[PDB]
Design an enzyme around this catalytic site. Structure first.
Site, mmCIF file in Angstrom:
data_model
loop_
_atom_site.group_PDB
_atom_site.id
_atom_site.type_symbol
_atom_site.label_atom_id
_atom_site.label_comp_id
_atom_site.label_asym_id
_atom_site.label_seq_id
_atom_site.Cartn_x
_atom_site.Cartn_y
_atom_site.Cartn_z
ATOM 1 N N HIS A 1 0.832 -1.205 0.000
ATOM 2 C CA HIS A 1 0.000 0.000 0.000
ATOM 3 C C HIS A 1 0.870 1.260 0.000
ATOM 4 O O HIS A 1 0.773 2.131 0.866
ATOM 5 C CB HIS A 1 -0.953 -0.023 1.188
ATOM 6 N N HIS B 1 1.561 1.641 -5.577
ATOM 7 C CA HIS B 1 0.155 1.257 -5.632
ATOM 8 C C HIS B 1 -0.732 2.440 -5.999
ATOM 9 O O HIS B 1 -1.692 2.289 -6.762
ATOM 10 C CB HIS B 1 -0.265 0.661 -4.290
ATOM 11 N N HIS C 1 -5.708 7.904 -2.514
ATOM 12 C CA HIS C 1 -6.701 7.042 -1.880
ATOM 13 C C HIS C 1 -6.128 6.181 -0.761
ATOM 14 O O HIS C 1 -6.902 5.646 0.040
ATOM 15 C CB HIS C 1 -7.363 6.146 -2.928
ATOM 16 N N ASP C 2 -4.811 6.018 -0.688
ATOM 17 C CA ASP C 2 -4.177 5.243 0.373
ATOM 18 C C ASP C 2 -3.095 6.063 1.058
ATOM 19 O O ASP C 2 -2.058 5.537 1.477
ATOM 20 C CB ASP C 2 -3.608 3.934 -0.167
ATOM 21 N N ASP D 1 -8.514 -0.107 -7.689
ATOM 22 C CA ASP D 1 -7.818 -0.604 -6.507
ATOM 23 C C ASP D 1 -7.372 -2.051 -6.692
ATOM 24 O O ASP D 1 -6.297 -2.442 -6.223
ATOM 25 C CB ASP D 1 -8.718 -0.478 -5.275
ATOM 26 N N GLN E 1 -6.363 -17.120 -3.883
ATOM 27 C CA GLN E 1 -6.457 -16.182 -4.998
ATOM 28 C C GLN E 1 -7.641 -16.512 -5.896
ATOM 29 O O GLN E 1 -8.375 -15.611 -6.317
ATOM 30 C CB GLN E 1 -5.156 -16.179 -5.799
#
Ligand SMILES: CN(C)C(=O)c1c(C2CN(c3cc(C(=O)NCC(N)=S)c4ccccc4n3)C2)nc2ccc(F)cn12
Ligand SMILES: [Mg+2]
Ligand SMILES: [Zn+2]
EC number: 3.1.4.17
Length: 312
Positions: free
Chosen positions: A68, A72, A106-107, A217, A269
């Site tokens: 993050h 990213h 956003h992060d 995202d 996954q």
């Protein structure tokens, strides 16, 4: 220095692709975002001096976390750019600006810990932000970076259009909370099936923007397989770091955050693609048909995870 950067010509074609990987161009990531803002909204939309200042400060406010991080934020920002570049007639000027700013922010100031970790161990931000903890922090970090001297790049416009572009940014940043995505995608599906989706309704655009944020995202699943496998290592090394920090408190972490369950990564996954990824890009592709290559690439990567599970 960021003002001086001009992107190489050989990448003007490549960056326009959905599956483009910013991985091997680390030095260019700040200038790549400038390029994308300059093509999606044009030069002379922001004042260049304040825009690069705003960008370079956002990078500094990203921590050296395994996943993050700054890589990213740009990756998410790029996928939004590819979505806006293939739906150009549908999103207003204030939207193309705000959403690309939202994705890069956003992060902001993420610590590599899930919203549950912070709430379960009474972190100070969990006191401030009870629900959607990190996402409210990210928006506050964005607003604070904006309000710095020489940093407010939306100062150039109406005090109404200013508050509009912020609540576009807050809504978009809040939507990156994966927990809110499930209820968001379900309501868009009802609106699609019943033919009740009206993009001239603000509440409906807000839902659709949120799905775009989720798709951006998660866009690590929309890359070519060698890219997707190596970004997965970053995702788990951050999850396993939170798990390590939980084992140091006598509390066993969930298998997702447990490094001793490396063997279950391929199965985990495939479950994520089918329960989360495929439904997201499927609804986005239904709503935005140009964004179909995202769903196609996500399918190819599901097959790949299947072949790892089967040894094939
Ligand atoms: C927030 N963030 C990064 C994500 O959410 C995430 C994951 C998670 C889900 N996964 C699991 C999840 C599980 C499980 O317990 N269940 C599976 C589900 N069906 S959710 C699991 C179980 C055992 C071992 C490993 C496991 N790894 C990591 N992968 C991606 C990929 C791209 C992306 F952009 C985002 N992500
Ligand atoms: Mg977030
Ligand atoms: Zn994110």
């Amino acid at each position: 220095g960021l003002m001086q950067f001009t992107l190489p010509v050989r990448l003007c074609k490549e960056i326009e692709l959905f599956h483009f990987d910013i991985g091997p161009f680390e030095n260019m990531w700040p200038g790549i975002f400038v390029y994308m803002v300059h093509r999606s909204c044009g030069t002379s939309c922001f004042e260049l001096e304040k825009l690069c200042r705003f960008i370079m400060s956002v990078k500094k406010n990203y921590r050296r976390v395994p996943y993050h991080n700054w890589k990213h934020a740009v990756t998410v920002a790029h996928c939004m750019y590819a979505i806006l570049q293939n739906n150009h007639t549908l999103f207003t000027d204030l939207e193309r600006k705000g959403l690309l700013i939202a994705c890069l922010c956003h992060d902001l100031d993420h610590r590599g810990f899930s919203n549950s970790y912070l709430q379960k161990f009474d972190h100070p931000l969990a006191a401030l932000y009870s629900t959607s903890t990190m996402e409210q922090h990210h928006f506050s970090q964005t607003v604070s970076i904006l309000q710095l001297e020489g940093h407010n790049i939306f100062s150039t416009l109406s005090s109404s259009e200013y508050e509009q572009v912020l609540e576009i940014i807050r809504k978009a940043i809040i939507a990156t909370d994966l927990a809110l995505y499930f209820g968001n995608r379900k309501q868009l599906e009802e609106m699609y099936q019943t033919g009740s989706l009206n993009l001239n309704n603000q509440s409906h655009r807000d839902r659709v923007i949120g799905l775009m944020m989720t798709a951006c995202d998660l866009c690590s699943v929309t890359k070519l397989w060698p890219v997707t496998k190596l970004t997965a290592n970053d995702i788990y090394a951050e999850f396993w770091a939170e798990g390590d920090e939980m084992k140091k408190l006598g509390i066993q972490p969930i298998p997702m955050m447990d490094r001793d369950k490396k063997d279950e990564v391929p199965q985990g996954q495939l479950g994520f693609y089918n329960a989360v990824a495929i439904p997201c890009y499927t609804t986005l592709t239904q709503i935005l048909p140009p964004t179909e290559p995202l769903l196609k690439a996500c399918r190819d990567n599901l097959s790949q995870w299947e072949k790892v599970i089967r040894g094939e």
